[PDB]
Design a protein around this nucleic acid. Structure first.
Ligand SMILES: [Mg+2]
Ligand SMILES: [Mg+2]
Ligand SMILES: [Mg+2]
Ligand SMILES: [Mg+2]
Ligand SMILES: [Mg+2]
Ligand SMILES: [Mg+2]
Ligand SMILES: [Mg+2]
Ligand SMILES: [Mg+2]
Ligand SMILES: [Mg+2]
Ligand SMILES: [Mg+2]
Ligand SMILES: [Mg+2]
Ligand SMILES: [Mg+2]
Ligand SMILES: [Mg+2]
Ligand SMILES: [Mg+2]
Ligand SMILES: [Mg+2]
Ligand SMILES: [Mg+2]
Ligand SMILES: [Mg+2]
Ligand SMILES: [Mg+2]
Ligand SMILES: [Mg+2]
Ligand SMILES: [Mg+2]
Ligand SMILES: [Mg+2]
Ligand SMILES: [Mg+2]
Ligand SMILES: [Mg+2]
Ligand SMILES: [Mg+2]
Ligand SMILES: [Mg+2]
Ligand SMILES: [Mg+2]
Ligand SMILES: [Mg+2]
Ligand SMILES: [Mg+2]
Ligand SMILES: [Mg+2]
Ligand SMILES: [Mg+2]
Ligand SMILES: [Mg+2]
Ligand SMILES: [Mg+2]
Ligand SMILES: [Mg+2]
Ligand SMILES: [Mg+2]
Ligand SMILES: [Mg+2]
Ligand SMILES: [Mg+2]
Ligand SMILES: [Mg+2]
Ligand SMILES: [Mg+2]
Ligand SMILES: [Mg+2]
Ligand SMILES: [Mg+2]
Ligand SMILES: [Mg+2]
Ligand SMILES: [Mg+2]
Ligand SMILES: [Mg+2]
Ligand SMILES: [Mg+2]
Ligand SMILES: [Mg+2]
Ligand SMILES: [Mg+2]
Ligand SMILES: [Mg+2]
Ligand SMILES: [Mg+2]
Ligand SMILES: [Mg+2]
Ligand SMILES: [Mg+2]
Ligand SMILES: [Mg+2]
Ligand SMILES: [Zn+2]
Lengths: 151, 83, 127, 224, 100, 100, 211, 115
RNA sequence: CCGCACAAGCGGUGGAGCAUGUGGUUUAAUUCGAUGCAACGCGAAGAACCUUACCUGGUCUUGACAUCCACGGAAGUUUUCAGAGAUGAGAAUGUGCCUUCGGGAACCGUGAGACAGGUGCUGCAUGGCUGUCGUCAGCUCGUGUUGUGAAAUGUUGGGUUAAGUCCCGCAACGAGCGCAACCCUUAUCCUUUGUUGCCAGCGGUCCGGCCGGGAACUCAAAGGAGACUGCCAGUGAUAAACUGGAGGAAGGUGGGGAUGACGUCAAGUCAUCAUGGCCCUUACGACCAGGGCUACACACGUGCUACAAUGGCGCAUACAAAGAGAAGCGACCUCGCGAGAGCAAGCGGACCUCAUAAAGUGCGUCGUAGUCCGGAUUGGAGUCUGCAACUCGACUCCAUGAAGUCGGAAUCGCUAGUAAUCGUGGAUCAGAAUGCCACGGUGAAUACGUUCCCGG
C-alpha cells in the first residue's frame, strides 16, 4: 500500500443473525480455515449468554464490545529521527476489530475445560467491565497517557 | 528380513566349502567374502574368516550365532573416537 | 412450466430446475437437511428465495457435481438465481443488487516452481 | 487587398509598445494607447509583392506550405491550403521537419501504410484491441502529418503566420533557401522573411483576410 | 457384425480434425450413416526438467504433450465402405485404430 | 559417461535376455505357494550360479545420446539435458512449452 | 540474462515441428533414437551439400525424410544415384522401408542454418570474423529480410580472452510470438577451440497463427 | 487392585487402566476384557473382586512386569556379549537400526555435550 | 519514486524428537562438484549389488568400447570342474547366401602395429547451457541541431501510469532492443458433434441411467462471441489520465502462467555433452568380489511430527480435482489381526484398475493430566521387492512410550481463493519420499501510511 490504498476486504454478513459484526468475529477466531468449527463455538457461547448472562445474545455482544473498546493508542512513529510514542485515535471499525481481537485473546487463557465456556465467560466478564480483556484496553490507555509529552 | 517362504539364504560356494570342511574337520579358517550368508547349524565349531572389505576377520561360530548373517560379526568401519 | 438454471462455483456445476408448487427442495435425490450438514450452506442455498420472497411458491430439483459442500452451495445459489431470473425476468435487478449473479471467478491458483505453494516461498535461511 | 480593406479588418493593430523588436521601426506608423500601430502604407505594396511571387511559384507547379500553429487560427490555416489544393502545418511545428525530410518521409510512409492497411483488410486478423490501437495510431499520425502527406517533396514556398512564434520553421527554410512569406507583427524579427508582410497575426479575422487573398492568388496561378 | 468404430489419436488438433472430416466424408459418400467425430478428452502429459546443467534446481521449465482423440462410429457399413476406408492414408501425424 | 560404462550397460541388457526364461521359471519355482522344500532349495541354489548381470534390476537407465545415469526420462530415453535441446529444436513430436 | 530458444517457443504458434509422427510410450524412445541416428548420418554425409534441415514423417509401415537443402543437384546427384543410395542406408538404420524427398531453399542467404554454417566455414578458413558477420548481415538484408542478428562467441581471432560480438540490422523482435523468427546455431572448431555462431533472421509476422 | 503386580491400575476406564500395567497395551487390554467378558468403559471402581480375580487370571497368560523386563534385558545382553554389530551399537549407546548419526541421534546419545 | 522493504496483520523458523543437506572430525575409503544474497531436501527425477567415479584385494595389456590387416574356425547352443568372482580348464553342434568351387558375408578366437581409453588438470584458453541484479524500466541508434571540441540533445521539464505507459511542453524528429500486445490457461454465452459421458420429459424397471429411448442439461473439444475507459458523471491544463456510476459472467493490463533488454559478477558447470592445451598409456585405461559414499564428540541450513479439548479415540455417514497404467495397473472371491498371499476378470483405457479423499457432520467417550497428548527409541515376531536387505530397504503386528507443557536474542513467508490447514496424484523407480513437481477441499486477518531498515 504505497501508491493506491486498497483498504480492508469486504465480508459477508453472519449467516445465523445477518450481522457483519458477528461474522467478522467468527472470521477473527477461526483457526486453520475451520469456519464451522469456530462458529459452532461462537453460537453456543452466545446462546448461553442469551439465556442466563443477559436478555439478548446479539446485544450482549455489543455491550461487551464497547466495554472493551479502546480510544487512544500509541503507534510508535519517529517524527524527525527520535523514537516518539505518538498517541493517535482509532477509527470505529478498527476499534471494533481491536475489541474482538482482544476478547478472543482473553478467552484463550481462560481454560475451564472447553472453548464455548471460555468465550461465554470472558464475553460476559468484559460486558460487566471486569474481564482479563478490559485490562489490556486500559493498559493501552495507560501507555497513551504516559506518552502525552509528544503531541 | 528374508521371507519364511524363501527360507534362509546361503551362498552356494560357502555351503559347499562348509560341507567339505565339516566332512574332514580341517578346523582351518575359511576365507570367504559372503557376508550375506546365514549361519546354519552345521557351521557350529568352525572358524570362518569373513571379509570386512580390507581383511578377513576370523569369526568363531557358536550356536547362539545360528540365524544371523556372517557380516553381522565382522565390523567394516573403524571408529576409535574423535579424541 | 419448468425453468432451468446452471450455476458454477469453485469447480462445482449445479443444474437447477424450478417449477410452481409446495416449496420442497431435493438436492441429488436428497432433502436440503440431508445433503448439507452445515447451516451456513443451507442459508446460502436459501438466500435467493428469501430475497425474492418466493419460498413456498417453487419446488426445486437440484443436482450438483464437483467441488466441496461449501462450493456446491455457492454453485446451487448461482443456479437458483439464474433459474429465478429466467422465471420472472423482473427479479434481475433485485438479484444482481444482492450480488447473486456475480459468478465469482475465484479459483485455486496453481503451485509454481521454486515455491512451496502459489504465493508461498521457502525460508530465506536468515540471509 | 486595399488599405481600406485591411483597415476595417484591423490589420493596423499591433502588440504593446512594451513589447517590440528593433528592426520593425521602419514599418511602424506610431503608437496609440501604448499600442504599436502598423503602417498599412508600408504593408500594402509588400503584401502585393508577396502575392505576385506566390502566383509565379504557383504557375510553375509550385507546392505551397501554409504555416501557423495558433490554436484558434489552426483551422483557418488548414482551410486556406485545402481551398487552393496545397499543403499546411496547423499543429505544433516539429523541429527539423524540412532539415530531416527523410525522417518526416518515413512518418508520412507509416501514415500511408496504416490508412492503406485499414482499407485493404487484416484488421479482423488483428485482435480487436490491436485494431483499435492501430486506429488510434493512424488518427495521431493523421493529425500530425495530414497536411503534408501529399506534399511529396520539399515545398517551393512557405506562408507563415506570426513569424516569431514559428521561428524554427523560418530558420530551417533559410537553411534550405526556401523562400519565406510571413505576416510579421511588430514584436517579430523580420530578418528571416524574404517577402515580409508586417501585420497583425493574433486576430483570426486579420489572418483570414491574408489567407483568403493568398489562396485566391495561388488558385489564379494554378488556372493560368 | 456390421459396425465399425475408429479412434484417431494425434498431437495436433488441426490435423486430426481434417482426418475425421475426410473419413466421414468418404463414409458418407457411400451412403453409410456415421456419428460425427465424438471429441474425447485430450490427454496432457506434462514433464518438468532442470534448464541448468549443474547447481541450479529452482530454475526449471515445463513441457507438455497434448494428445487429441476422436471417435467415429459407422453403424451400418455397406461392404464397399469397409474397404473404401483402408484406401485412406491419413497424415503421418495421425494414428488410427479400427475396431469392429 | 565413459565408454566402458556404456559397454557395461549393453552387456547387462544383452545378458538379461539370454537368461530371462530360465530366471523366470526358477523364480516361479522358488515362490511357488506349494512346492517340495528340496526342489525350492535347489531352485534357490541354482538362481545364484547364473551371471549376476542377468537380473534386470542391475541395469541403470542411461541417456541413449550421452550415457548420463541421472535425470533420465523413460518417455524419451534421454536425460533432462538432451530432452531439452531436442525439444527446442523441434525434434520431439508434440512436445511444447507448457503454461496453465 | 538467458533467452528462451526462439524456435522452441514458437513451436505450434508459427513454427512447425521437424518431426511429425504419432507414437505411444512403447515406441516413442525408439523412434527418437532412430530419428537422431538418421539426422546424424545425413549430416555427416551432406555436410558439403549445404543441407538446411531434415524433417522426418513416419507413416505406420514406413519412414519419410524430407531434406531441405540449398544445392539439390549435389545431393540428388547424377541420375539420382547417391540420394537413392542414401535411401538404402537410412532404411538400414530406421529398420523400416524408407523414402527420401529433396526440397530447395530458393534463398540460401535467408535460412539461418546455412548462414551459420557459412560463417563457421569461413572462420575455419581464417576469415576474420567481422568481415563474415557484416557480409552475412548485408546479404540477408539485400534479399528482403525484415531484420537479421548475427553473433559470434568465443576466442575471436585466437585472442586468449574470449568475447562475444554481435551485429544487428533491421528489426528482430524476439518477444513477439506472432513473429516469424528463423533461428539456428552452428560452431567452428578452430585451431584455438570452439567458436559459436548464432543467427536470427526475421521474415515478417505471421497472421492466422499456423495457418 | 494389584492385578499384575505391585503396580495398581487407576480407577479410570478398564481398558486404559489395564494399559497402565507394563507389558499390557491397548490391544492386549481389549483382549483381556473380551476373555473376562468385562466391557471396555466400566471403571475399576464399581468392579467386583471375583471380576478383578478373573482379570488377574487372564493377565497371567502374558508375560508382564518383571518377568518381561528380565526377558528383554537378557535379549539385549545376548546381543551385547554375542559380539554382533547390533550388540556393539547397544554397548556404545548408539542407534542400532541404521538411523543416521551425523545428526538426529539425540534420544540414544542423550543430551548434547559441548567440547 | 517504487518493491511483503517497513508499518498493519496472520502463520512460522530459532527450543524438542526425527528426516535431509553441508561444515568439521573420523576413516582403508568416507568419490567429485556447488560456498554471502545468487551453495547447504543443490547436481542426485530416488547410493543394499548395480549406480560408482572412492578404498582393499584379486586380475588384463591392441585392451571393456572403433576401424584397419593377417591366420584359424559358421554363428549360435547344452553341461562339468577349480575360483569370492573376474577368469582358467574342459566335455556335448554346423553347412542358410552367390556360389565365375575362387571365396567373400554374418560372427568368434588369435598375433602384430596405427591406435583405442581417461568422470585425468585448467570453467582464469573455450562452445553450449544456467544463476543473479530483475520482469527492474531501462539500453541505444539514424538524421537534425548545439558546441573550437571531449560531448550534449533526443532520453530532460510539467503531469500521469505496472511501465522510457501516455499526453503536453521543449531543437528536436524518428527508430531499434525492451514495456504492452500476438501465445497458454481460467471466468460467461453461442454454434457443431453425443460415446465409453449426460438423464429433463417420458414406458418398464431386478429401483442400478439399468433399459427402451431422449440430444434438453452437466460434460467433452473444435470453432466463435465478449471488455474498449466503450457508455455516463465529476476532477484535470478544452490534455493525458484519475475517481465514481450504469450495464455486464467479467471493468479499468479481470485472475494465473509463459515470455528475462544492453549488460554486471574472469558467477556456475572441462563430471551431461562438445572442445584448445597439457598429462597417463603392462596405467591416471579395463575386469571382478567385498567395503565405502549411510561413520559421529560436534556446528550450521532447509523440512517433518508435536507439545493437545478449535483436540485424542470409537462408531456412523457425506462432498473432489488432477493424474498414471502392458515385464504395467490389477478387480471380485477366498485365506491372514495386519503388511500381504492365492485364484483370477477387466483395461493400452471418458469403459477396467490404481481408488474409500481427508479435514467435515452426527452420536458416544476423554476432563486438562506429561494425560486415552506425543510418538522417539528399543525388544520380540513378520510381509514384500530383489541373485542378495549384516553393514544399509520399505512396511505390518505385539510390547516399549524419550524429549516435548508453544520455544531467548534474532529472523522468514504472505495482500485473496492468497496465508493457514487437509488430503490426492505424478516423475525417478525391482524395491526404496517428511524432498521435488502437480491437484483439489475448507478458508482468513490486515494495509493509517512511506519516518526507519533492505534492494532498485
Ligand atoms: Mg527384524
Ligand atoms: Mg492448496
Ligand atoms: Mg489416461
Ligand atoms: Mg566420452
Ligand atoms: Mg536401479
Ligand atoms: Mg503399539
Ligand atoms: Mg536410512
Ligand atoms: Mg512486519
Ligand atoms: Mg539447534
Ligand atoms: Mg529445531
Ligand atoms: Mg568432509
Ligand atoms: Mg561432499
Ligand atoms: Mg529447494
Ligand atoms: Mg588394485
Ligand atoms: Mg565353483
Ligand atoms: Mg576367412
Ligand atoms: Mg590379441
Ligand atoms: Mg585420445
Ligand atoms: Mg566464468
Ligand atoms: Mg569451482
Ligand atoms: Mg515491470
Ligand atoms: Mg522511471
Ligand atoms: Mg537513460
Ligand atoms: Mg544523453
Ligand atoms: Mg516524467
Ligand atoms: Mg516505449
Ligand atoms: Mg520529449
Ligand atoms: Mg421413468
Ligand atoms: Mg447440443
Ligand atoms: Mg474456446
Ligand atoms: Mg482487458
Ligand atoms: Mg472541467
Ligand atoms: Mg455493478
Ligand atoms: Mg463499475
Ligand atoms: Mg486477458
Ligand atoms: Mg511482454
Ligand atoms: Mg528463463
Ligand atoms: Mg572463476
Ligand atoms: Mg573437476
Ligand atoms: Mg583405474
Ligand atoms: Mg563393485
Ligand atoms: Mg550423499
Ligand atoms: Mg495417541
Ligand atoms: Mg508411478
Ligand atoms: Mg479378513
Ligand atoms: Mg495411490
Ligand atoms: Mg470426526
Ligand atoms: Mg519434561
Ligand atoms: Mg501437503
Ligand atoms: Mg518406486
Ligand atoms: Mg535506498
Ligand atoms: Zn503577434
Amino acid at each position: 500500500p504505497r501508491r493506491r490504498v486498497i483498504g480492508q476486504r469486504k465480508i459477508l454478513p453472519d449467516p445465523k443473525f445477518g450481522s457483519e459484526l458477528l461474522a467478522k468475529f467468527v472470521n477473527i477466531l477461526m483457526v486453520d480455515g475451520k469456519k464451522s468449527t469456530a462458529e459452532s463455538i461462537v453460537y453456543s457461547a452466545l446462546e448461553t449468554l442469551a439465556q442466563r448472562s443477559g436478555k439478548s445474545e446479539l446485544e450482549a455482544f455489543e455491550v461487551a464490545l464497547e466495554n472493551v473498546r479502546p480510544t487512544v493508542e500509541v503507534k510508535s512513529r519517529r517524527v524527525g529521527g527520535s523514537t516518539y510514542q505518538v498517541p493517535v485515535e482509532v477509527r470505529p471499525v478498527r476499534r471494533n476489530a481491536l475489541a474482538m481481537r482482544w476478547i478472543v485473546e482473553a478467552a484463550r487463557k481462560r481454560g475451564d475445560k472447553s472453548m464455548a465456556l471460555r468465550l461465554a465467560n470472558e464475553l460476559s466478564d468484559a460486558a460487566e467491565n471486569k474481564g482479563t480483556a478490559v485490562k489490556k484496553r486500559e493498559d493501552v490507555h495507560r501507555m497513551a497517557e504516559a506518552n502525552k509529552a509528544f503531541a | 528380513p528374508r521371507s519364511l517362504k524363501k527360507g534362509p539364504f546361503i551362498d552356494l560356494h560357502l555351503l559347499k566349502k562348509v560341507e567339505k570342511a565339516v566332512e574332514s574337520g580341517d578346523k582351518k579358517p575359511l576365507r570367504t567374502w559372503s557376508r550375506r550368508s546365514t549361519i546354519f547349524p552345521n557351521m557350529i565349531g568352525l572358524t570362518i574368516a569373513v571379509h570386512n572389505g580390507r581383511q578377513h576377520v576370523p569369526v568363531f561360530v557358536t550356536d547362539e550365532m545360528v540365524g544371523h548373517k556372517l557380516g553381522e560379526f565382522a565390523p567394516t568401519r573403524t571408529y576409535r573416537g574423535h579424541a | 412450466n419448468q425453468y432451468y438454471g446452471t450455476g458454477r462455483r469453485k469447480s462445482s456445476a449445479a443444474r437447477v430446475f424450478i417449477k410452481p408448487g409446495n416449496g420442497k427442495i431435493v438436492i441429488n435425490q436428497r432433502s436440503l437437511e440431508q445433503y448439507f450438514g452445515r447451516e451456513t450452506a443451507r442459508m446460502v442455498v436459501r438466500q435467493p428465495l428469501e430475497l425474492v420472497d418466493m419460498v413456498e411458491k417453487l419446488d426445486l430439483y437440484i443436482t450438483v457435481k464437483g467441488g466441496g459442500i461449501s462450493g456446491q452451495a455457492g454453485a446451487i445459489r448461482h443456479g437458483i438465481t439464474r433459474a429465478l431470473m429466467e422465471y420472472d425476468e423482473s427479479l434481475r435487478s433485485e438479484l444482481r443488487k444482492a450480488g447473486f449473479v456475480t459468478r465469482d471467478a475465484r479459483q485455486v491458483e496453481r503451485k509454481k516452481v521454486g515455491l512451496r505453494k502459489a504465493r508461498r516461498r521457502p525460508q530465506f535461511s536468515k540471509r | 487587398v486595399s488599405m481600406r480593406d485591411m483597415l476595417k479588418a484591423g490589420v493596423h493593430f499591433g502588440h504593446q509598445t512594451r513589447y517590440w523588436n528593433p528592426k520593425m521601426k521602419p514599418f511602424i506608423f506610431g503608437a496609440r494607447n501604448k499600442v504599436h500601430i502598423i503602417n498599412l502604407e508600408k504593408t500594402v505594396p509588400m503584401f502585393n509583392e508577396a502575392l505576385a511571387e506566390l502566383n509565379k511559384i504557383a504557375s510553375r507547379k509550385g507546392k505551397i506550405l501554409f504555416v501557423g500553429t495558433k490554436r484558434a487560427a489552426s483551422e483557418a490555416v488548414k482551410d486556406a491550403a485545402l481551398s487552393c489544393d496545397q499543403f499546411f502545418v496547423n499543429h505544433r511545428w516539429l523541429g527539423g521537419m524540412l532539415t530531416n525530410w527523410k525522417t518526416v518521409r518515413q512518418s508520412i510512409k507509416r501514415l500511408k501504410d496504416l490508412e492503406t492497411q485499414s482499407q485493404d483488410g487484416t484488421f479482423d486478423k488483428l485482435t480487436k484491441k490491436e485494431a483499435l490501437m492501430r486506429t488510434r495510431e493512424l488518427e495521431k499520425l493523421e493529425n500530425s502529418l495530414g497536411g503534408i502527406k501529399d506534399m511529396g517533396g520539399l515545398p517551393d514556398a512557405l506562408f507563415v503566420i506570426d513569424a516569431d512564434h514559428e521561428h524554427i520553421a523560418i530558420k530551417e527554410a533559410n537553411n534550405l533557401g526556401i523562400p519565406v512569406f510571413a505576416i510579421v507583427d511588430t514584436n517579430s524579427d523580420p530578418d528571416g522573411v524574404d517577402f515580409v508582410i508586417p501585420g497583425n497575426d493574433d486576430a483570426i479575422r486579420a489572418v483570414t483576410l491574408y489567407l483568403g487573398a493568398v489562396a485566391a492568388t495561388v488558385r489564379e496561378g494554378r488556372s493560368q | 457384425n456390421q459396425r465399425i468404430r475408429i479412434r484417431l489419436k494425434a498431437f495436433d488438433h488441426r490435423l486430426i480434425d481434417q482426418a475425421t472430416a475426410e473419413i466421414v466424408e468418404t463414409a458418407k459418400r457411400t451412403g453409410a450413416q456415421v456419428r460425427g467425430p465424438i471429441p474425447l478428452p485430450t490427454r496432457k502429459e506434462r514433464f518438468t526438467v532442470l534448464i541448468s546443467p549443474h547447481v541450479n534446481k529452482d530454475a526449471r521449465d515445463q513441457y507438455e504433450i497434448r494428445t487429441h482423440l476422436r471417435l467415429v462410429d459407422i453403424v451400418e457399413p455397406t461392404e464397399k465402405t469397409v474397404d473404401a476406408l483402408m484406401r485412406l492414408d491419413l497424415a503421418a501425424g495421425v494414428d488410427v485404430q479400427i475396431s469392429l | 559417461a565413459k565408454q566402458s560404462m556404456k559397454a557395461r550397460e549393453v552387456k547387462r541388457v544383452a545378458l538379461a535376455d539370454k537368461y530371462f526364461a530360465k530366471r523366470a521359471e526358477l523364480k516361479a519355482i522358488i515362490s511357488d505357494v506349494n512346492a517340495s522344500d528340496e526342489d525350492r532349495w535347489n531352485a534357490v541354489l541354482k538362481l545364484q550360479t547364473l551371471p549376476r548381470d542377468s537380473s534386470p534390476s542391475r541395469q541403470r537407465n542411461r541417456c541413449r545420446q550421452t550415457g548420463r545415469p541421472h535425470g533420465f526420462l523413460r518417455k524419451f530415453g534421454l536425460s533432462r539435458i538432451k530432452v531439452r535441446e531436442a525439444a527446442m529444436r523441434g525434434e520431439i513430436p508434440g512436445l511444447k512449452k507448457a503454461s496453465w | 540474462g538467458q533467452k528462451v530458444h526462439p524456435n522452441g517457443i514458437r513451436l505450434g504458434i508459427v513454427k512447425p515441428w521437424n518431426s511429425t509422427w504419432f507414437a505411444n510410450t512403447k515406441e516413442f524412445a525408439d523412434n527418437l533414437d532412430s530419428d537422431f541416428k538418421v539426422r546424424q548420418y545425413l549430416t555427416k554425409e551432406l555436410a558439403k551439400a549445404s543441407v538446411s534441415r531434415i524433417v522426418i514423417e513416419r507413416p505406420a509401415k514406413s519412414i519419410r525424410v524430407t531434406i531441405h537443402t540449398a544445392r539439390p543437384g549435389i545431393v540428388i546427384g547424377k541420375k539420382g544415384e547417391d540420394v537413392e543410395k542414401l535411401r538404402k542406408v537410412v532404411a538400414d538404420i530406421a529398420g523400416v522401408p524408407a523414402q527420401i524427398n529433396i526440397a530447395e531453399v530458393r534463398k540460401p542467404e535467408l535460412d539461418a542454418k546455412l548462414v551459420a554454417d557459412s560463417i563457421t566455414s569461413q572462420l575455419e578458413r581464417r576469415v576474420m570474423f567481422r568481415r563474415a558477420m557484416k557480409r552475412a548481415v548485408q546479404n540477408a538484408m539485400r534479399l528482403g529480410a525484415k531484420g537479421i542478428k548475427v553473433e559470434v562467441s568465443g576466442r575471436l581471432g585466437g585472442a586468449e580472452i574470449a568475447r562475444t560480438e554481435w551485429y544487428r540490422e533491421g528489426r528482430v523482435p524476439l518477444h513477439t510470438l506472432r513473429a516469424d523468427i528463423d533461428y539456428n546455431t552452428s560452431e567452428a572448431h578452430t585451431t584455438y577451440g570452439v567458436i559459436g555462431v548464432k543467427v536470427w533472421i526475421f521474415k515478417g509476422e505471421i497472421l492466422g497463427g499456423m495457418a | 487392585a494389584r492385578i499384575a503386580g505391585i503396580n495398581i491400575p487407576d480407577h479410570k476406564h478398564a481398558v486404559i487402566a489395564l494399559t497402565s500395567i507394563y507389558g499390557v497395551g491397548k490391544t492386549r487390554s481389549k483382549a483381556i476384557l473380551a476373555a473376562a467378558g468385562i466391557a471396555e468403559d466400566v471403571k475399576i471402581s464399581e468392579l467386583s473382586e471375583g471380576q478383578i480375580d478373573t482379570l488377574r487370571d487372564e493377565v497371567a497368560k502374558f508375560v508382564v512386569e518383571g518377568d518381561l523386563r528380565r526377558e528383554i534385558s537378557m535379549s539385549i545382553k545376548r546381543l551385547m556379549d554375542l559380539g554382533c554389530y547390533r550388540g556393539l551399537r547397544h554397548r556404545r549407546g548408539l542407534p542400532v537400526r541404521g538411523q543416521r548419526t551425523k545428526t538426529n541421534a539425540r534420544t540414544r546419545k542423550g543430551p548434547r555435550k559441548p567440547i
